[PDB]
């Protein structure tokens, strides 16, 4: 501080900048038919 004053950079001109931000709030609702996935069409697999 030179005496009682500090050196500061104060803006003399300005603009407005836009910034994007994507926030995920949802996801694909995956549903699994466990019986069709594990055993397909096969009666012998569905029994087991």
């Amino acid at each position: 501080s030179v005496g009682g004053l500090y050196e500061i950079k104060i803006p003399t001109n300005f603009t407005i900048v836009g910034q994007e931000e994507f926030i995920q709030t949802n996801s694909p609702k995956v549903t699994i038919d466990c019986s069709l996935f594990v055993c397909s069409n096969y009666a012998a697999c569905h029994d087991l």
Binding site: T31, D33, S35, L36, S40, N41
Partner: protein
């Protein structure tokens, strides 16, 4: 809301394909051959 068990469309026809006019393998004729080899010189025949 109930997701029911997966179905598969039933087949409406049967497709059966075989190569026609193929000769008989004659496996019995080679097995019934009276010149039977020993395990030392076991014999191989390929049927196709």
């Amino acid at each position: 809301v109930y997701d029911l068990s997966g179905f598969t469309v039933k087949p409406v026809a049967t497709v059966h394909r075989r190569i026609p006019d193929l000769p008989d393998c004659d496996i019995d004729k080679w097995l019934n051959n009276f010149n039977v080899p020993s395990p030392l010189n076991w014999e191989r025949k390929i049927f196709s």
